């Protein structure tokens, strides 16, 4: 299956031809293929011969061609393809919409080109278009002052559901838009005024994006140019009167000081409202508009701080109690010093509020008991505040940061409190007094140097997932954290002494006291020696991450004190030993790794030899990861030593000569192959020669097996073929 | 030409540096003129009386850290031959006993980091000339030495002994029968929990006593630590120090002290330096009888005396601090408190010579900054690692008192220095610097500070000369940025990025030209890839631009050639750092538009495949050219035709495989040529050259090299370092031998 890999999905067969240095549309493409991904290549010309005799094609991706003049597409180059629905032509340095596109198309993407004329003929006549993407064409870099949209070019597209013109200079919403529209994206379009007539038709509209017009252009990485003065976007009172279906409204970075409550009079289903990066401190305090949003589930009022203002208190309108459907409130970057019980009274009566996001407010103190008064809080996000011890890609939501606030696997356990990146340099006795019952707690990165003694967390004893990463904690005391008898996940990654000094010693006895600890992460603790007790012991532990410590020192111990260090983890199935500067694992030591192991990582060490013999000791082992070592040869008789192994990763080793499903030998020193569904081989210095004919034939006799990056499976020698993919030659 | 050691003249005397050379024996190829021999950090296993035969003149030997990667075997009387041996260093040698038969000539002996548990007469008594004896670290916590045994009176015979260090051994009690000659006695970490009146006896000449780390304050300690019973402090008799009238330096750090007996200092009128770090003296700081007893104290360290879990509103400073009349530096780190008021520091305001106040690591939320106006000689206000908001191992180091300058000397040289690094100044409040004295040196490093600089932020301290803004998230796009500091000479904006760590950051560097006396600017690691509106840096004054870790590759592959002249407007620039800019190729005309004034050009750690040597003609003043760590393949045949000014050319870690014949030829304005770590197999046939570095090349040790070998012997002036690492790659049997080794 070449030159592309060809694969089943659904009832459709797919050709992945992305990122392979192709200089032309191959003619070696499977005839069954209905979707062709040619993205991120070096293709320069598309003609009506490029896709000849291929009626079946339904989707083509030509994005990012070519790399490192743009893409030349003849007139009617695609017209032949009677079934073409989806055509992606992003980042192609196109100067005009290609002429003679097939009427079959339902999705067309021309983002990141140089198209300044949206002409009928170009797109008129593509009546079947549902989704049309024209964003990022007349962006500030280079020639287009304004994007010329021929009058009524879209009125003919009466099935158009999505139109994106974001990141082009338009000045005004185009007239003569089809009523069929459901999602209209007009972010960053230099539209400083919205008339009553601009959206009058669009009854079916569920999403409107006007973000970044009259931007709040403060320290924004991307070019930012506000309207004259600090002037906000101008939106007519009745601009939105006929948009009864709107669910998503984005007004981020429109320099808004006032929000007209009449905008929402006829908008009873509004679900999500983005008001990040405006100046709505006043409006938050009064807030007529808040009574008009009884179905709002998500409100983002982030980064509406006033420059230079660090008020004692936040002023929350009482009208917030009228957001009855509110599930998530995002109030980052208001910036204020104190949160009192009373300031959040309006929110205490909202029945479905499960997320309060107060990140990046530099709050010095919070009256923490106030969070007891919420019936459905699942997420309290307080990262980047100042709590003390208590005694690019177009398809990104630029204005709203998009990944989960708290790691899903932590918040899964229950109520989550994230106090990362605050001032909690030690754990005060009253640190967690008056909190609700917390299951997930983040203390990451507080320069916290607490000597854990078994009393610090007793006020929230039902924590299940505890992130303590990037602190300077001492867990020598065997009672450390034992007050959390229900703890399942503990992350102590990157924990070191305060002074970041050479030395330190560890005592890991506290581990055994937990009867339900599942995952423990000790990565990059620079553990080189254990005190008094040389064995980790746990009946419950399933995953130990030990990367970035000094097992080289521990196992070269003159007394062999640590030969059985992990053996006491009787239930362990995953072990990470990466980055331990291992040259040689004493045979004995390796045999005393838990027999229960399922996944063993010893990558990025300096292993010169591996005793393959010992694998019989691990009947359950499925994955063995030995990447990035210095290994020289493989055993001839692997089948003797394991029946279990599915995946063996050997990339970045020195192997020069040659029951399971995946073998990675990429980036080794193989000159040839003499004589299971994935074999990785790229990066080996193949001697492209006839000896190689054996292996070549083997490839043809096993098409099911996947070999990725064939294009990077390269002849090194002799000189005649060097740099040539082994497959092309005969 | 010396081998294996490098030999040099130091003062009057000749010296051999044979450190870290993988030697497996004491060489016999050592210069006869040599009086000091450094064989440290090698693979030597045996020292016999033959090791140093024919080196009578040796005065100092360093055998430290032999061997590397069981210990060093020294025969009896191995050194006895050497009549002039004064200084013998035997550190980290895994020795089990003091070598027997040491020469009586010794004045300094160091046996630190070994396994010596018996300090015997026979070992050292009768080395009557010893002045300095170091026996620290022999019976530490790790391994066998349960306790360390000192034969009675072993030191009484050493009547010239001035320094005795027994730190980091288990002793339990100060040894008896110590010579009166002692001036410095180090007993740190010796498990000595009690000090009697009799312990210091007749040590009337003593100027330094170190008792730190006995009954340690163990909390969170970086190194293994064992406190005494309960939280008990060291026990020091009232009269323990009554006859130590000369004492100048007393170290009581980490002795768990709650109370300081003022009678300890009754007879100690000259005490200069007093270390009390890591104790529990919060109470004593508030009352502090002892403070009246120290009129000549210049340095007081009361750091890290915080109480566990205590974060009091206020610090309580005794009025008795006003009796420390000679005080030059006060170190009060890690007391930990929330607020500093004017009144709290009244006692210190009247001390005439107090020039350093060190309040690092106190997590102070607010300070009444006007209070520092009331000090006549403050040169250093050190406030790192506090919580100010916006206003609207090596045994020869001090183990307890962190030793480098608090503030970079080159910053503090300009004047009063204020260090507010690692605080909470996420923006610059309008009142940030209201009420400060006149500050010349200011550190704002690492405050997550996202200020949009507009030319007003620093107007209350307008005479700042050295400004460190590193590791913040500042915007200096406004051309008025920092212009209120018209006297600014040094600006460090290293590691400045957007708050949200989102990339794509654009820059405007017009503000630079406003300063008529800006000398050094550091824009390193700002990931600058594009400039808005103005594409030229311009300055009449600037001498040094550090531009490392930006994207000149992007800037110079500009399709419009917008940045061909980017630096040309820096008319006075003499040093430019272009390292780490991912440069593959510098457009010829971009290189020509680098300032002609340049004296030092660094383009190292890029990916240069080619270098247009011809352009060096445009730089008649260029003295240093640094092209290390690139991908360069060959050298022009006649460098002399392109420069008559170049002294130093660094080409380490490049792909050069052939030396042009007639190169290194003609004009020789070249003193230093570094071709180490390249791909040279040999050097053919073909100067004021005085250093040639060649180590790390895969030399082909077959007979053709003989040319180069002979050339070495015929040019002894030319220094070639690391000859031991100038190594045959081929043919096998020669591989791994130094080429000088070949017959
Ligand atoms: C300290 O050490 C701990 C434990 O190792 C680290 O925590 C783990 O981090 C890993 C990422 O390293 C997490 O694994 C990732 O979880 C994602 C979510 O998984 C969902 O779907 C799976 C399907 O099986 C479910 O099992 C699961 O319940 C979730 O609903 C996955 O998206 C990731 O998938 C990965 O594998 C596939 C290949 O099969 C790839 O296609 C993906 O791209 C990706 O590589 C991944 O599995 C794991 O969840 C974490 N565990 C815990 C307890 O949090 C910490 O990160 C570490 N700390 C630090 C600072 O390093
Ligand atoms: C942003 O950019 C600036 C400018 O580069 C950096 O500040 C400079 O940092 C360098 C070191 O990285 C400083 O250079 C060092 O100065 C030391 C002090 O020198 C004293 O003694 C000499 C005696 O000749 C005098 O010339 C000098 O005036 C001082 O009295 C030197 O000790 C260093 O010497 C180096 O060279 C010799 C080789 O001959 C070696 O033996 C030394 O060990 C060492 O390698 C060195 O010259 C420079 O002084 C700083 N300048 C300023 C203005 O501050 C900032 O570091 C940078 N910021 C960041 C975050 O990188
Ligand atoms: C203004 O706010 C609105 C919300 O009110 C916001 O609209 C959202 O835009 C984002 C980004 O363009 C859309 O997210 C995409 O959804 C599509 C369709 O299902 C997917 O193709 C995308 O996922 C792919 O690509 C991702 C990243 O490139 C990958 O991570 C992913 O695996 C997929 O391969 C992506 O999720 C989102 O649909 C809309 N919201 C809607 C339609 O309701 C708008 O972007 C805001 N404006 C700005 C400038 O931020
Ligand atoms: C308790 O406090 C006392 C001071 O009251 C302190 O004594 C000091 O010890 C340090 C460390 O040994 C000494 O500083 C050294 O002085 C000597 C001689 O002049 C030098 O050899 C040392 O420099 C060498 O090493 C340095 C780095 O290791 C290098 O910079 C240099 O190149 C040299 O190779 C170093 O400057 C100091 O002499 C004494 N103070 C005296 C004698 O007054 C003692 O260390 C404290 N105790 C503990 C446990 O910390
Ligand atoms: C606790 O807080 C830290 C900081 O917010 C989180 O660390 C980030 O993790 C994400 C997602 O895995 C990474 O992509 C980022 O690089 C990390 N950010 C920083 C600032 O280090 C961490 O995930 C949080 N822990 C939990 C369980 O939610
Ligand atoms: C400003 O404060 C920062 C942090 O205190 C100083 O940064 C240290 O610089 C020294 C010497 O160059 C290094 O050895 C340390 O590793 C640095 N620490 C950190 C956390 O970066 C900086 O030197 C100070 N600036 C001045 C001018 O004194
Ligand atoms: C907090 S009120 C404020 N006033 N000036 C600033 C920065 C300068 C103008 O952009 N900030 C501020 C605001 C925000 C949102 C963050 C993240 C930071 C670091 C600082
Ligand atoms: C100062 S109050 C305090 N109470 N317990 C601690 C840590 C436990 C001591 O081993 N700290 C504290 C003290 C210091 C000195 C620093 C630096 C930190 C981060 C915290
Ligand atoms: C609006 O959407 C509905 C589906 O609810 C559809 O039937 C109608 O035709 C759409 N309006 C158009 C295409 O103008
Ligand atoms: C709260 O959530 C439930 C389930 O998602 C839903 O039925 C209910 O209507 C929501 N409450 C409001 C006021 O919307
Ligand atoms: C092993 O861990 C699993 C979870 O992965 C758990 O259900 C079980 O309790 C553990 N088994 C034993 C024998 O401890
Ligand atoms: C692997 O180690 C075992 C010791 O348990 C030994 O018997 C065997 O010889 C080793 N195999 C190899 C190839 O070194
Ligand atoms: C004590 O010190 C002085 C030098 O400061 C000296 O004159 C006297 O002899 C010394 N005592 C000895 C060597 O016993
Ligand atoms: C202050 O310093 C000067 C010069 O360094 C010195 O002469 C003077 O004695 C010192 N003052 C006191 C009170 O010791
Ligand atoms: C440039 O700086 C140098 C110091 O390198 C100095 O000698 C010269 O006077 C300065 N010239 C100007 C014009 O500032
Ligand atoms: C270097 O550039 C100059 C242009 O000034 C040109 O004359 C010369 O040929 C170039 N040399 C090389 C080796 O490219």
UniProtKB/Swiss-Prot annotation, chain A:
Result of altering residue 362 to A: Abolishes responses to both ssRNA and chemical ligands
Ranges where the LRRCT domain occurs: 684-730
Glycosylated position list: 10, 48, 56, 72, 117, 204, 242, 250, 315, 319, 352, 373, 442, 477, 513, 521, 571, 611, 674
GO molecular function, one term: double-stranded RNA binding
Keywords tagged on the record: Disease variant, Disulfide bond, Endosome, Glycoprotein, Immunity, Inflammatory response, Innate immunity, Leucine-rich repeat, Membrane, Receptor, Repeat, Signal, Transmembrane, Transmembrane helix, Ubl conjugation
Stretches in topological domain Extracellular: 1-730
Residue spans of the LRR repeats: 83-104, 105-125, 128-150, 159-180, 181-201, 204-225, 245-266, 269-291, 295-317, 325-346, 352-373, 376-391, 413-434, 437-458, 462-482, 486-508, 516-537, 540-561, 571-592, 596-616, 620-641, 644-658, 659-675
Description of how activity is regulated: Activated by RNAs having enough uridines.
PTM comment, free text: Ubiquitinated by RNF216; leading to degradation by the proteasome.
Subunit (UniProt): Homodimer. Interacts with MYD88 via their respective TIR domains. Interacts with UNC93B1. Interacts with BTK. Interacts with SMPDL3B.
Protein name (Swiss-Prot/TrEMBL): Toll-like receptor 8
Top-level taxonomy: Eukaryota, Metazoa, Chordata, Craniata, Vertebrata
Coverage span on the entire protein: 33 to 818 of 1041
């Amino acid at each position: 299956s070449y030159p592309c890999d060809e694969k089943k999905q659904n009832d459709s067969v797919i050709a992945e031809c992305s990122n392979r240095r192709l200089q032309e549309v191959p003619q070696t493409v499977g005839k069954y293929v209905t979707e062709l991904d040619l993205s991120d290549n070096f293709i320069t010309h598309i003609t009506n011969e490029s896709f000849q005799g291929l009626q079946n094609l339904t989707k083509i991706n030509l994005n990012h061609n070519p790399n490192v003049n743009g893409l030349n597409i003849t007139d009617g180059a695609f017209l032949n393809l009677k079934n073409l629905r989806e055509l992606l032509l992003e980042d192609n340095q196109l100067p005009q919409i290609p002429s003679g596109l097939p009427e079959s198309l339902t999705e067309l993407s021309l983002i990141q080109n140089n198209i300044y004329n949206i002409t009928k003929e170009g797109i008129s006549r593509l009546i079947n278009l549902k989704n049309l993407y024209l964003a990022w064409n007349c962006y500030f870099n280079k020639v287009c002052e304004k994007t010329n949209i021929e009058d009524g070019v879209f009125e003919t597209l009466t099935n158009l559901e999505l139109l994106s013109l974001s990141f082009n200079s338009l000045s005004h919403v185009p007239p003569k838009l089809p009523s069929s529209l459901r999602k209209l994206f007009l972010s960053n379009t230099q539209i400083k005024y919205i008339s009553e007539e601009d959206f009058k038709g669009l009854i079916n509209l569920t999403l409107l994006d006007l973000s970044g017009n009259c931007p709040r252009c403060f320290n924004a990485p991307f070019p930012c140019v506000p309207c004259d003065g600090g002037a906000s976007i101008n939106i007519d009172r009745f601009a939105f009167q006929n948009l009864t279906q709107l669910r998503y409204l984005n007004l981020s970075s429109t320099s808004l000081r006032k929000i007209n409550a009449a905008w929402f009079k006829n908008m009873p289903h509004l679900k999500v409202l983005d008001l990040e990066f405006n100046y709505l401190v006043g409006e938050i305090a009064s807030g007529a508009f808040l009574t008009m949003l009884p179905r709002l589930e998500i409100l983002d009022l982030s980064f509406n701080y006033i420059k230079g203002s660090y008020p004692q208190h936040i002023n929350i309108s009482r009208n917030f109690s009228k957001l009855l459907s509110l599930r998530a409130l995002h109030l980052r970057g208001y910036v204020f010093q104190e949160l009192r019980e009373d300031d959040f009274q309006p929110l205490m009566q909202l029945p479905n509020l499960s997320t309060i996001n107060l990140g990046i407010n530099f709050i010095k103190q919070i009256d923490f008991k106030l969070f007891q008064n919420f019936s459905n809080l699942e997420i309290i996000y307080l990262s980047e505040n100042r709590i003390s011890p208590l005694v690019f890609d177009p398809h990104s939501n630029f204005y709203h940061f998009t990944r989960p606030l708290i790691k899903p696997q932590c918040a899964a356990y229950g109520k989550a409190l994230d106090l990362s990146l605050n001032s909690i340099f030690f754990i005060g006795p009253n640190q967690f007094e008056n909190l609700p019952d917390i299951a997930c707690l983040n203390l990451s990165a507080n320069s916290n140097a607490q000597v854990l003694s078994g009393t610090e967390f007793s006020a929230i004893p039902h924590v299940k997932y505890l992130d303590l990463t990037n602190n300077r904690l001492d867990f020598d005391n065997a009672s450390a954290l034992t007050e959390l008898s229900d703890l399942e996940v503990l992350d102590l990654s990157y924990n070191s002494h305060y002074f970041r000094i050479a030395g330190v010693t560890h005592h890991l006895e506290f581990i055994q006291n937990f009867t339900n600890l599942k995952v423990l992460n000790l990565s990059h603790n620079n553990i080189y020696t254990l005190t008094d007790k040389y064995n980790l012991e746990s009946k419950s532990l399933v995953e130990l991450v030990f990367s970035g410590n000094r097992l080289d020192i521990l196992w070269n111990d003159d007394d062999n004190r640590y030969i059985s260090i992990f053996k006491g983890l009787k239930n362990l199935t995953r072990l990470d030993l990466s980055l331990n500067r291992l040259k040689h694992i004493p045979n004995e030591a390796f045999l005393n790794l838990p027999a229960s192991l399922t996944e063993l990582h010893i990558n990025d060490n300096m292993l010169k030899f591996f005793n393959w013999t010992l694998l019989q000791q691990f009947p359950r082992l499925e994955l063995l990861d030995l990447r990035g070592n210095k290994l020289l040869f493989l055993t001839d008789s692997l089948s003797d030593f394991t029946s279990s192994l599915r995946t063996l990763l050997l990339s970045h080793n020195r192997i020069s000569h040659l029951s399971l499903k995946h073998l990675d030998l990429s980036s080794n020193l193989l000159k040839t192959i003499n004589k299971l569904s994935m074999l990785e081989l790229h990066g080996n210095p193949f001697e492209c020669t006839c000896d190689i004919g054996d292996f070549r034939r083997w490839m043809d006799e096993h098409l099911n097996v996947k070999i990725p990056r064939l294009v990077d499976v390269i002849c090194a020698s002799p000189g005649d073929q060097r740099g040539k993919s082994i497959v092309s030659l005969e």
